[PDB]
């Protein structure tokens, strides 16, 4: 339902370090690109079993930050860190956030 560039701040160490992701939003599942060419289909998240969270407050402002975490069922991100996502303006987070919702993600 949306597509656009979204950085990750939780990369695992061995390929740590935040970086930023062409990212394909649909009611289905979250799919993850090197580039805009979506050629790679490097990995994906499902919609279902997902929760959106806020920020915690206090955290780095440099970036506006939102995350995806979960607890109940086995959909979860990489065991290193909670998804947090990021972008440059509150904008696109709150587009993203919107997004996911309504492709199905649960609020926090």
Same mark, same amino acid.
């Given at each position: ?6 950085? %990750?701040?939780?990369?695992? %160490? @061995? ?11 649909? !009611? &289905? +599942? #979250? ?12 990995? @994906?998240?499902?919609?279902?079993? #997902? ?8 955290? @780095?402002?440099?970036?506006? %930050?939102?995350?995806?975490? +979960?607890?109940?069922?086995? +959909? ?9 996502? !990021? ?10 956030? !919107?997004?996911?919702?309504? !492709?199905?993600?649960?609020? &926090?």
């Amino acid at each position: 339902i949306r597509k656009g560039w979204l950085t %990750i701040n939780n990369i695992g %160490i @061995m390929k740590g370090g935040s970086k930023e992701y062409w990212f394909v939003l649909t !009611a &289905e +599942n #979250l799919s993850w690109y090197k580039d805009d060419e979506e050629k790679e289909k490097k990995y @994906m998240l499902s919609v279902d079993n #997902l929760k959106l969270r806020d920020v915690e407050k206090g955290f @780095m402002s440099s970036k506006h %930050i939102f995350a995806l975490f +979960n607890t109940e069922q086995r +959909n979860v991100y990489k065991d290193y860190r909670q998804l947090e996502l !990021a972008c440059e303006t509150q904008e696109e987070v709150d587009s993203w956030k !919107a997004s996911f919702l309504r !492709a199905g993600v649960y609020p &926090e």
